[PDB]
Design a protein around this ligand. Structure first.
Ligand code: NA
Length: 96
């Protein structure tokens, strides 16, 4: 379940991810059940903010909403705020 990686605040949904850069394709590859994070491969090098940019691009396209990194800019563990979306909407899109 993706519910272990999401929570809904007044501003939108905080999606908790753990990234691996340099991947063949930017995509969701799993769920980390202990850390409560979605495992996301990112097809970008981890230099000059490029993995962060690609990560945000991917989720902005998926959710149709602005996505910002609220924590973990320089970590593999990142929390993304998906602005103005509900948890129900986020679950629907992640399950596509
Ligand atoms: Na980066």
């Amino acid at each position: 379940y993706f519910q272990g990686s999401l929570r809904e605040t007044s501003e939108g949904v905080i999606l908790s991810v753990i990234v691996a850069p340099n991947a063949r394709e930017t995509k969701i590859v799993g769920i980390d059940g202990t850390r409560g994070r979605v495992k996301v491969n990112v097809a970008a090098p981890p230099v000059k903010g490029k993995a962060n940019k690609e990560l945000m691009k991917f989720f902005k396209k998926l959710f149709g909403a602005e996505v910002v990194i609220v924590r973990g800019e320089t970590s593999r563990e990142k929390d993304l705020l998906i602005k103005g979306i509900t948890k129900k909407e986020v679950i629907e899109k992640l399950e596509l």
